[PDB]
């Protein structure tokens, strides 16, 4: 205990004790970059993007998201993006195809791990596709916590 | 000299050679043999998270005034040096026309796409003899209802003369040159909810409206020559159909149009209300 | 076995922070590099030293 | 300052302690993720080949 | 799952309700079973149903 | 499945224990504290009745 | 002294320019190469010397 | 069934640019597919 | 919110005597600690945990999503 | 009469959107009367707080 | 810092459940009760760095 240090029973810390959620959000939207027409919220294939991750991205669907409710590691991508540039060579220059990607999908925070919970897709001030997701994360207090 | 960098692992030589970075630690590695090929990557996010240039061009744009550890005797001989060097370049003309098109749009309460279209509907031609002035009024009116278009959103030619007077007409060989312009360089559906915006309605008046539009557009009786008409009196026979007293003569002083074609209208739809209503 | 001294113990009231553990535990050797300076990132986000 | 005389360095640790009463004054105590983080380089002699190709 | 509540929260609010424990010595722990995925021998099945009525 | 009480308090049957022995501090494993008598700062305890003062 | 530090080199005729590491472009992760300060002025330079020297 | 939008317990199946405002409903927030699909717990 | 399971302290099943802890206040005009008195809960441990608990959950609920 | 007003009302709403976003506590002049911490962020931690 | 102290090297005996874990006595010198600050640790890389951390 020493120093204000603290002794707890693990017993009562399994009984349900200080058990706790967290919440967190994203931003994520598109842009217009022409010529106008924006991204696209996109599920990548192997030949799809410019500097992949190894995001392992078989978590999204045909919208370009991640149905609520499975779980996620922490190196794992939820959203996903394509540059829409138009005109820049678009498809056949300077890069394989692979078409435009540029792909810019965010991954979680690398350490963090849990469960996705009530996608929403709404449009923005103009009128865009934006996209924010919650994910949903059990804490159990453990031995380095500010009491 | 080619300008060229290729990675290829040493010791595989199967391909381009698949290979995989490990941003964790910065290096990249011939996932066969498991060899690293370099060290010490660069950031690719950080500096988005650290801190519009294709319309100013590649000459860059500054202005410049005052601050805290300064005097104002000097900088207001730095307000009047500021316009020593605008007449070098066209882009104080080109920022005058951003700034009046930006004027233009935000009075319309255009939003941040539409205005940076119409930048780059500018932006795009600028300079030729088809050109050739015109009011230089005439190009910006152009410009924003072509980039207004291509950000798939509708406004009226009465809109548009509402906010400038440009006689119409020079608005309109405008418009054609620089449709040739584009087309080298290289949908009134969406004005019916303005419509009931303005008259204040609920959602299924709106889509029986589109609805009918669609299948008239189908089968016949254009009727109306400028068909944006035989849409307003789609909206007319809609309410009609419902209770709600939209009477014609509010209408036509809302809409700033012609009653006897919305009678012209109702006569024909009068005739042709039978296979038009879903539920 | 009994116990020689005596205790004050009994029911109080207390509260959980926010500066939990896993924010603040950060290790890391040999990652990314700053383009102005060569030297380690910064952030516990983007992995820093 | 930020950069010469002092400036970010490698192979660094940064959690919160607990007091322990086993352990004397020579010791610390690392926790095991940290310990899979680090590292160190030795080298290889007719001493310490067994032991290194062990943990390889 | 619809409820206002949180699904592992279910869980652990499940995980404290005790059970029927007489006959405990004739069946098997899964660790010390030769099986995988909880035998007839080795566990028990639970199910529950509600509704919105 | 099986679980036991010592890994986590999901298979505890106990969860209360009662535990006494010299209630008349004969052994005197023990003083007591006080701040001017033994006696009437403390309590009897409810198993006095077993063993005589 | 005169081998190092002679009044005339004191005033400056020839400027020398930076390389493109204390000036780096920082590739501003949409369309940008993301162009910084230090170019920027020395464009400003190179801009208001050609102005002058066209005036002369 | 890939949207909801509203207080309707109604699957809207929308998939593309369908009056995307709900029909039945009053919204224009889009509500998104919770997941049919089989999840796993771990309750220790 | 819930009253929970299981008190830390003691331990033993609590909250069959929830809704009880209830009906023991409106249709009998009882006083608390006689309550909990008839109620039969010895230790102070679990009597705690009743006498602090306080509902969220109703006014969770009577929120009306989908 | 019309055209200019309408931007006006651009100004006037766009300013009054910067300050109340920035917290910079005048226009677009580069922090002239300038005091800053009046534009806080809303502690959402607890309903105490 | 402040002093010549705040500056100990140590030997490690690894642990799990991870935190730091070090001795009560050393404490007063490193001027830092358990009020939750954080430490900072290196590790060197060669044998005369190991070494005169070692004898030092
Ligand atoms: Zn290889
Ligand atoms: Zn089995
Ligand atoms: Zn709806
Ligand atoms: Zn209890």
């Known amino acids: 205990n020493q120093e204000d240090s603290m002794i707890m029973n693990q017993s009562s810390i399994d009984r349900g004790l200080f058990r706790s959620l967290f919440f967190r959000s994203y931003m994520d939207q598109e842009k217009k970059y022409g010529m106008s027409i924006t991204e696209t919220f996109e599920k990548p294939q192997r030949t799809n993007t410019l500097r992949m991750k190894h995001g392992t991205y078989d978590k999204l669907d045909d919208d370009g998201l991640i149905a609520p409710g499975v779980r996620v590691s922490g190196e794992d991508v939820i959203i996903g993006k394509t540059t829409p540039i138009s005109p820049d060579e678009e498809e056949l220059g300077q890069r394989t195809a692979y078409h435009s990607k540029r792909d810019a999908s965010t991954p979680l925070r690398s350490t963090e791990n849990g469960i996705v919970d009530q996608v929403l897709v709404t449009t923005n001030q103009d009128g865009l596709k934006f996209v924010k997701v919650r994910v949903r994360t059990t804490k159990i207090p453990q031995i380095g916590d500010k009491f | 000299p080619n300008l060229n960098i290729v990675l290829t692992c040493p010791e595989c030589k199967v391909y381009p050679p698949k290979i995989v970075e490990r941003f964790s630690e910065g290096d990249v590695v011939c996932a066969l043999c498991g060899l690293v090929l370099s060290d010490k990557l660069v950031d690719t996010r950080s500096e988005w998270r650290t801190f519009n240039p294709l319309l100013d061009g590649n000459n860059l744009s500054t202005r410049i005034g005052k601050g805290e550890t300064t005097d104002m005797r000097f900088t207001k001989e730095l307000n009047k040096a500021q316009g020593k060097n605008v007449m070098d370049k066209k882009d104080n003309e080109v920022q005058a026309a951003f700034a009046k098109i930006t004027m233009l749009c935000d009075a319309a309460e255009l939003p941040k796409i539409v205005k940076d279209c119409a930048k780059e509907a500018y932006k795009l031609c600028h300079d030729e003899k088809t050109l050739k002035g015109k009011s230089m009024e005439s190009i910006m009116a152009a410009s924003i209802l072509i980039g207004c278009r291509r950000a798939e959103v509708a406004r009226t030619f009465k809109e548009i003369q509402s906010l400038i007077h440009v006689k119409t007409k020079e608005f309109g060989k405008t418009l054609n040159i620089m449709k040739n312009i584009l087309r080298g360089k290289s949908q009134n559906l969406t004005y019916i909810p303005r419509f009931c915006s303005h008259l204040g309605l609920p959602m299924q008046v709106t889509t029986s409206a589109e609805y009918t539009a669609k299948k008239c557009k189908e089968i016949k009786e254009i009727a109306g020559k400028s068909p944006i008409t035989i849409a307003v009196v789609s909206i007319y026979l809609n309410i009609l159909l419902f209770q709600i007293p939209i009477t014609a003569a509010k209408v036509g002083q809302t809409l700033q149009v012609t009653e006897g074609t919305i009678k012209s209208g109702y006569k024909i739809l009068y005739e042709h209300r039978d296979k038009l209503v879903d539920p | 076995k009994k116990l020689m001294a005596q205790i004050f113990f009994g029911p109080t009231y207390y509260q959980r922070l926010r500066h939990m553990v896993d924010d603040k535990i950060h290790a890391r050797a040999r990652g990314p590099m700053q383009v102005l300076t060569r030297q380690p990132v910064e952030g516990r986000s983007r992995d820093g030293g | 300052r930020g950069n010469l005389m002092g400036k970010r360095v490698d192979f660094s640790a940064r959690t919160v302690i607990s007091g322990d009463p086993n352990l004397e004054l020579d010791q610390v105590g690392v926790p095991k993720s940290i310990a899979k983080t680090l590292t160190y380089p030795e080298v290889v002699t007719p001493y310490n080949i067994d032991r290194l190709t062990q943990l390889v | 799952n619809t409820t206002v509540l949180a699904d592992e929260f279910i869980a652990h609010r499940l995980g404290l309700i005790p059970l029927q424990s007489m006959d405990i010595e004739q069946l098997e722990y899964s660790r010390d079973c030769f099986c995988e995925d909880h035998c007839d021998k080795c566990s028990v099945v639970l199910t529950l149903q509600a509704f919105g009525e | 499945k099986k679980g036991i009480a010592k890994e986590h308090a999901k298979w505890g049957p106990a969860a209360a224990i009662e535990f006494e022995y010299d209630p008349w501090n004969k052994l005197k494993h023990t003083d007591y504290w006080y701040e001017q008598d033994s006696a009437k700062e403390w309590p009897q305890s409810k198993n006095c009745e077993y063993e005589d003062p | ?56 | 069934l890939k949207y909801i939008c509203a207080e309707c317990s109604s699957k809207l199946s929308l998939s593309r640019t369908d009056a995307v405002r709900c029909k039945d409903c009053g919204h224009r927030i889009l509500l998104k597919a919770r997941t049919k699909r089989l999840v796993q717990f771990e309750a220790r | 919110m819930i009253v929970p399971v299981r008190c830390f302290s003691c331990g033993k099943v609590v909250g069959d005597k929830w809704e009880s802890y209830l009906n023991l206040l409106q249709e009998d005009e009882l006083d608390e600690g006689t309550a909990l008195s008839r109620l039969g809960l010895k230790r102070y441990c679990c009597r705690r945990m009743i006498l602090t608990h306080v509902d969220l959950i109703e006014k969770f609920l009577r929120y009306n999503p989908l | 009469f019309n055209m200019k007003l309408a931007i006006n009302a651009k100004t006037i709403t766009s300013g009054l959107k910067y300050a109340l976003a920035t917290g910079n506590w005048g226009e677009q002049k580069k922090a002239m009367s300038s005091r800053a911490g009046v534009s806080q962020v809303l502690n959402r931690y607890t309903y105490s707080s | 810092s402040l002093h010549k102290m705040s500056m100990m090297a140590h030997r490690v005996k690894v642990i799990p459940y991870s935190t730091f874990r070090l001795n009560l006595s050393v404490t007063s010198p490193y001027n830092a009760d358990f009020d939750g600050d954080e430490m900072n640790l290196h590790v060197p890389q060669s044998e005369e760095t190991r070494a005169e951390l070692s004898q030092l």
């Open chain 7, 1 to 56: 002294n005169e081998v190092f530090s002679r009044p005339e080199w004191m005033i400056l005729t020839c400027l020398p320019v930076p390389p493109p590491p204390v000036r780096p472009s920082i590739s501003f992760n949409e369309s940008q190469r993301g162009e910084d300060d230090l170019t920027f002025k020395l464009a400003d330079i190179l801009k208001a010397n050609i102005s002058l020297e066209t005036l002369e």
